[PDB]
Design a protein around this nucleic acid. Structure first.
Lengths: 87, 109, 50, 102
RNA sequence: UAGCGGUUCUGACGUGCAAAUCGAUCGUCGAAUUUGGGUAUAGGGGCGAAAGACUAAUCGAACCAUCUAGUAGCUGGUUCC
RNA sequence: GCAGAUCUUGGUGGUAGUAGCAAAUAUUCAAAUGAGAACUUUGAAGACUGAAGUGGGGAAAGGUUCCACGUCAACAGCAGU
RNA sequence: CUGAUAACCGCAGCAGGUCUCCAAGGUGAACAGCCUCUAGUUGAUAGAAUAAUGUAGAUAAGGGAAGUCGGCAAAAUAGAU
RNA sequence: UGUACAACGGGGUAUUGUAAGCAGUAGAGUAGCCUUGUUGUUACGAUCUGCUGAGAUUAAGCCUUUGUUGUCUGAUUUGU
């Protein structure tokens, strides 16, 4: 009565899709996410979960803007255009 | 050579379905008419007719009649002929009583 | 689930469009090692957990 | 062939359910051709597919038994398995006694 | 009766249909009744018509990660002539 | 440097072509397709669930299972068109 | 679209669990049991023999609990006036 | 190729218990008619009586049979 026929009654969701991190870790009755922490102002990371800081940190996504920083540093943050030389 | 002789019979299914489970009497009545015709006609392929499959099963699985008249024909097979060229074809003949009927070669002319 | 929100139906659209084998012409490409679709999801075998 | 679809559509077109349709095995090649409901409505019209009329549940022993019970049979003590208030309550006999007198 | 329990056979099964199910028998059956959803309460803390019972097959003290390769007078191994 | 730590990962044996594939009353004849039909499809029988149904709709859950065409390597603990 | 002994959960197409609406005729006190109409299935590996020992179902002359820890299991009993 | 064997039919044995069908001044009565009765009849009517120790079944591990119809040369292995 505590094994398979109790797994019978099990049709609801404690968690649904987080809006910030998109993981199904967002607790419905609590109204908070367990993986990232939404709707907190922060994003929860703990030094005991060093693999969490491997999964969810910088470099793991697209880096839609940081990718063009070091390149943009190398030129000393140029502004303007370029001239034409030959051919 | 030809051997297309067609005969009538009284198969006595009382003594063939004795002691057999009630949900297996009419299936064995079918599988016993096949063995009966393989005995008489000698061929291996037996074809029953669906009117006989009705007359076996007039009374459920367990109400197979004691005696059935049969018209058995022995006819040859063609058009990608079988493992044996001849086969039997078993039909009923309608009668109010299968009691008291000797076997008879049928005249077909 | 038979009466849904748009977020769920949009994720179903994405899980349906991914539900195909390889395009066959990727099997011929220069420096290939892709042999099949490794991220196949059936609906009997593996639930998506939305 | 494989006439799953056509038996389904023929039930859904005639309106009688699937247990009463009749797709005759002589014209069966034609029935494999008739794939849409607009073809099935022709095959029901001419006679390739019919209705298979109702299994008769004749209430003619019901009527004969009730005709006997109207003349007062089948009402001894073994034909009677519930308490006398359960067959006809005392409250209904009192209601009928007294609304009549009143 | 439906339902909700689960007594007895110490019945079946016991490398099962099933990490507790099946059959028969049985208790209760309009109320301190059953039950959906919502919600509240969270770990030495909840919650308990109390059995140290239940807390997601985990409970006289949940689960996960880290300190942590914890310590071991105690078992077991410990590689060619 | 290896023979064993109920050592780790992997692989392969005997047992063994055995234990098993036995709840839910039940299937049979013909024809069609096909390389091949105890199982497909149609027809004829026989039956069952018997309107707290094995019937019609749905909530939760699932996610394309819905419907047609083509097709049987792998799945459907036998088979399979 | 399914809403479940194959579409959800139980590692599985797992005899488990899981909220609710409509609901015919007869018998009968009755939504009981038994039979049928409307709908829906005919799916659960099969063929042949049918010895042991089993599981489920039964019956027994005469005695009747002497059986056993204990009448455990069956039997009887039963509806209505 | 045989007073063989088989399948049916026949006879005996055996179980049960008098079939279906038809008939009857039998049938508690009930109605319905008429000369209304001194069995007055028609129709209904569980049942009963006559045919009916009838009918059914009878071998699957019963017996017997000159009857009717059939059957009777398929595969393999073996030596000092």
């Amino acid at each position: 009565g505590k094994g398979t026929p109790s797994f019978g009654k099990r049709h609801n969701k404690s968690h649904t899709l987080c809006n910030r991190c998109g993981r199904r870790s967002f607790h419905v009755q609590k109204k908070t996410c367990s993986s990232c922490g939404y709707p907190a102002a922060k994003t929860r990371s703990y030094n005991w979960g060093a693999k969490a800081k491997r999964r969810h940190t910088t470099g793991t996504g697209r880096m839609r803007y940081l990718k063009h920083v070091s390149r943009r540093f190398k030129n000393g943050f140029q502004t303007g255009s370029a001239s034409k030389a030959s051919a | 050579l030809k051997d297309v002789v067609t005969r009538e019979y009284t198969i006595n299914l009382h003594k063939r379905l004795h002691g057999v489970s009630f949900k297996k009497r009419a299936p064995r009545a079918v599988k016993e008419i096949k063995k009966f015709a393989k005995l008489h006609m000698g061929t291996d392929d037996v074809r029953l007719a669906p009117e006989l499959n009705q007359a076996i099963w007039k009374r459920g699985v367990k109400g197979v009649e004691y005696r059935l008249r049969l018209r058995i024909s022995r006819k040859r097979n063609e058009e990608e002929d079988a493992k044996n060229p001849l086969f039997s074809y078993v039909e009923p003949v309608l009668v109010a009583s299968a009691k008291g009927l000797q076997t008879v070669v049928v005249e077909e002319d | 689930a038979a009466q849904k929100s748009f977020r769920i139906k949009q994720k179903m659209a994405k899980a349906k469009k991914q539900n195909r084998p390889l395009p066959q012409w990727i099997r011929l490409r220069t420096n290939n090692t892709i042999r099949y679709n490794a991220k196949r999801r059936n609906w009997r075998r593996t639930k998506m957990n939305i | 062939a494989n006439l799953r679809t056509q038996k389904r559509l023929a039930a859904s077109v005639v309106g009688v359910g699937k247990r009463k349709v009749w797709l005759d095995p002589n014209e069966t090649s034609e029935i494999a051709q008739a794939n849409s409901r607009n073809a099935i409505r022709k095959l029901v019209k001419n006679g390739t597919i019919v209705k298979k009329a109702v299994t008769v549940h004749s209430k003619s022993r019901t009527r004969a038994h009730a005709q006997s019970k109207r003349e007062g049979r089948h009402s001894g003590y073994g034909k009677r398995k519930g308490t006398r208030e359960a067959r006809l309550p005392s409250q209904v006999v009192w209601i009928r006694r007294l609304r009549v007198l009143r």
